[PDB]
């Protein structure tokens, strides 16, 4: 519906997050021009191309197909530039990315909250798996915080739909790749699956429990292990060699052994032995529930 969010009633409020190929802004949709309206988040491309706008169309269809408490809410599209461009309209979640929230609001985060966020992320990912969607970019930078009690997967720009007959998607046009969240078979064979999302979730869980101490981020920790001197493809070569022979991110300071064990099971080089997101949500909620109270 091109009349749902008309570009002339979509008012700027704040820049929220930008990268090489996309940007998100806070806007107010005020159809009555009475200084009221709901606040929304607006994603738009950067350095657009025909190929990227086609992908963005796929991204929009993917998000529109998703309705879940732990998936950011799709609201519509703005066909801006006189209906010669595309912008994606989403609900606005006010505490930003989980990566920033962990750093900025340590005062209101304890292990209980971390497990609750863990559970919620797994449940959102269970849901994606029922659509045969592979996220491919799971990281705390792409999780959003609605409030102290709820997080949602917040971006789907790299998400792919599995082929009808395969359980993996083989990417044949790799661009910007978050290699320090990648499963080994994604690095070596460009294969992405629910199981490689589980690998990446293992890194998310690590992130949560490092509390995003800059020296403990996965890129920083892997580069320390690889050698900070290394540059270029040599980094990838050493990362692959490291992972294939059981090199792993360390247990974070203060992390319970049981949570670290979940991490290490997600980081299984044997794809089929990785737990499912349903296993993980149940396991985490049972940890939470087995506590006193
Ligand atoms: N989550 C999360 C983190 C982000 N963010 C989301 C809010 C927010 N805040 C409050 N409420 C909200 N409601 C809905 C969103 C939202 C703030 N920051 C940063 N991310 C954007 C810029 C950087 N990005 C690329 O450069 C990029 C790289 C490769 N491919 C693509 C493409 F186009 F194909 F998709 C790209 F866009 C990725 C997209 C989303």
Numbering used by the authors: 840 to 1132
The authors write:
Particularly, itacitinib demonstrated a more potent inhibition of JAK1 over JAK2. Structural analysis demonstrated that the binding mode of JAK1-selective itacitinib differs from the other compounds: it binds to the pocket with the G-loop in an extended conformation reaching the tip of the G-loop, where it forms hydrogen bonds to backbone amides of Phe860 and Gly861. Other inhibitors do not extend to the tip of the G-loop. In addition, itacitinib makes a water-mediated hydrogen bond to Asn981. At the hinge, itacitinib forms hydrogen bonds to backbone carbonyl of Glu930 and backbone amide of Leu932. The highly favorable binding entropy of itacitinib is likely linked to the displacement of three ordered water molecules (visible in the momelotinib crystal structure) from the hydrated cavity near the tip of the G-loop. A more sparsely populated second water cluster was located at the tip of the G-loop and is exclusive to itacitinib. Gandotinib, itacitinib, and ilginatinib take advantage of this as the compounds clash with the alanine in JAK3. In the JAK2–itacitinib complex, which has a similar G-loop conformation, the G-loop is not stabilized with similar stacking interactions.
Janus kinase (JAK) family of nonreceptor tyrosine kinases consists of JAK1–3 and TYK2 (tyrosine kinase 2) that serve as triggering kinases for cellular signaling of over 50 cytokines and hormones in regulation of blood and immune cells and metabolism. JAK2 activity is crucial for hematopoietic signaling particularly in homomeric myeloid, and hormone receptors and activating mutations of JAK2 have been identified in multiple malignancies, most notably Philadelphia chromosome-negative myeloproliferative neoplasms (MPNs), where mutated JAK2 drives the disease manifestations. MPNs are clonal neoplastic diseases initiated in the bone marrow from a mutated hematopoietic stem cell. All of these compounds are type-I inhibitors that target the conserved active conformation of the adenosine 5′-triphosphate (ATP)-binding pocket of the kinase domain and show variable target selectivity and differences in clinical profiles. Structural analysis showed that all compounds anchor to the ATP-pocket of the kinase domain of JAK2 by making two or three hydrogen bonds with the hinge region.
